Symmetry: C3
Amino acid sequence: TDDPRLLSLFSAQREEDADIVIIGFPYDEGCVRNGGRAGAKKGPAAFRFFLQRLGSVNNLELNVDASHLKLYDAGDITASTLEEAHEKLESKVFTVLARGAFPFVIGGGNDQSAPNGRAMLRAFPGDVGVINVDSHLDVRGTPFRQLLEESSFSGKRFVEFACQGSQCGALHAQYVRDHQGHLMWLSEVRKKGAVAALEDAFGLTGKNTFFSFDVDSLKSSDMPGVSCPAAVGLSAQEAFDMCFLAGKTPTVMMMDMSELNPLVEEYRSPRVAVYMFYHFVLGFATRP
Amino acid sequence: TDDPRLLSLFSAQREEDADIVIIGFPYDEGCVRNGGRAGAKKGPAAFRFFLQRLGSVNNLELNVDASHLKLYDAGDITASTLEEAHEKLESKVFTVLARGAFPFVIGGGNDQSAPNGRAMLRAFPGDVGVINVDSHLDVRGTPFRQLLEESSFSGKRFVEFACQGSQCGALHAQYVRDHQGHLMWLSEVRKKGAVAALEDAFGLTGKNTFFSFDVDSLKSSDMPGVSCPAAVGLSAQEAFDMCFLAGKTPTVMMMDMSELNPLVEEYRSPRVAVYMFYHFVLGFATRP
Amino acid sequence: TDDPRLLSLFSAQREEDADIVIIGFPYDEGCVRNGGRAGAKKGPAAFRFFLQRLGSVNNLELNVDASHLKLYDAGDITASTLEEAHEKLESKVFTVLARGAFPFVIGGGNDQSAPNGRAMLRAFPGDVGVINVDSHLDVRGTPFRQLLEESSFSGKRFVEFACQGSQCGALHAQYVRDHQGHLMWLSEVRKKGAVAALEDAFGLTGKNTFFSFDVDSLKSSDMPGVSCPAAVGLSAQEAFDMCFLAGKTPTVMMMDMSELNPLVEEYRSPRVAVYMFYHFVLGFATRP
Ligand SMILES: [Mn+2]
Ligand SMILES: [Mn+2]
Ligand SMILES: [Mn+2]
Ligand SMILES: [Mn+2]
Ligand SMILES: [Mn+2]
Ligand SMILES: [Mn+2]
């Protein structure tokens, strides 16, 4: 048309030919445990709905043309049991990783991040960095406890980003810091500027960074459709700006997006999620 | 009462005696075409509801008393066919224009802007400026294509204000710029300050400026009740501040407000729309 | 658990032993009169719901541990007639005041503030300050008219904070100012920074300050669940920051919170209200 969008980049016939591969994880488990509501398993469908509709491939405001990228939608990870779904998720992300392609996993609840991280720890033995963008710091199932408990993974390369002190147990903080992980509280992200704060974060995570974006880290005024709606947090613009940085940052080797919940809110929030991926995609179009 | 509001300025018995004339255009057509939902035809009723209720005529925070202005509500433009409704709309705005009064048109979808602009091109032969405040830049029915295609109208005097690169076809940008029109992306409006950016815009539009305000240019966090809800965009305060500037700016000769959709959201969004008009009215009270 | 919250501070067996005492006032009367909707009487229940669930007692982002404070929930003020409910409310707040404890009153509509203020004027004869955080300045039942009309109370120590010129009768302003009270318009609070502006306000109110927080002074984008939803106003973060200041400010001797309305919105808004109290509580933990 007069206005080619994200849909037009899905010209890769074989997954092996796509620069970026989208994987769905339609399962609830995550913040629904810590008070949140059911429904995150519907996130992948809602994301896909707007995926077919949004995001000009040539953005003249940012002046980035992503027309050259190929996207592929590998579908949903489905399994008879939950732990098996975890296994098939990890195995799938790893394969995409192993061949040099970029995996983006749309969820689904926080718990997908554990499989995703292990896929990383296999793909880059001992040289993985991880950032959790999340208003929550829950590490008592608790995906980042699992990763901190990994032999291969160095905690000096783990950042909790935009976490909120009103929602973070002190034992939880203690654990991360005792593992030499870094807490970057919302107030400080906001103090520095989100993108600048996130630059700092990639300095800490370094090579082979897993960019994990819990969307309940955004304020519910912009992002109400999540299992654990946030009173304060990142604005939609900050989110976009951060996704663009991640995309242009060549050490960022995969991304997941957690907690999208269309039962909580079904129109505005899925648009934000697609626009976040969109900005990532634009950023990606700029790397060598 | 102890608190005279906008309703009290409707003391003009004859339209001819009102400084400002309100015209309703209860028709859907506009962004409902480009994905949006039906319902904008209900905007004029919802606007009128809050019109009867809001806006202290003497504002001691801005220290502007609008007590001296007279408003008149000329009602809705109604017609058996749509193109006829367009004709009666243009003809009506022109008459108000022709006699020196100020027309404010409440919609209704974007498409009203075409009739409105032609009313301007008749009233000020060859000396019209136009600003489209809109997160969208759609010019492939497409009201501003129609105006750019006008012999009389000079594109050097056309500004797209607060448009969003994630929602603007590059062919669409190309067309405007190839007509010597100006793109003022959201990011740059926000960079400069909305009012300062809008001052710049009136410098470009100049004499006999048509102030066209698509309300889906505001973020849906403030302005959810529109046909095409915006993830990012102008805040309500920015909108008010911009309407006040327009009002005090003597080259601004008419105004329309598009895309208000009470089926999408019916309480918060109509209040914003009335408050936007309210600020315009205050600004107007300050011109010579 | 790994994450002790506000609930854990309710270890005071006898009210007399609690540093802070929560009193519910489940009555509508207030802004429902001036256009608002019914439902504020449900605020205390909704507040209590989230009270059982939110607010880490040790906040490592602010680095304040409130673990040492004791809270007590004295329940709801209930009465056969409304004026009697007013009497029992005042009498109760006074008793808590008289013994040195800190009363926090959750409403309920604006009208609770009159009883609350009289409780103050009894407890500190002639030496009371009052701040009304409110997008409204309504003083024509009208709780602050009642207090300004008090012999004992000095108007030089009354501040209207974050009031909005689009919603304030000029006779209303005139009355306050003619009583030597101070208007601190939203625009100026925002100009200075909310906390800095509020510091200024406590300078004016001084000793024995009643911190009265109408929650419809926040923008409805953050705080939609109120009887009179605000188009513009304080952000949730500003609210929290202001509540923290109030808490650490030793001249602040009681607090009330008005206009919470779960019939308007029932999940996001009650969370904000509890988080506001939470921040107050943290601030309180810091005073000598
Ligand atoms: Mn999480
Ligand atoms: Mn979270
Ligand atoms: Mn438009
Ligand atoms: Mn638009
Ligand atoms: Mn009030
Ligand atoms: Mn109020």
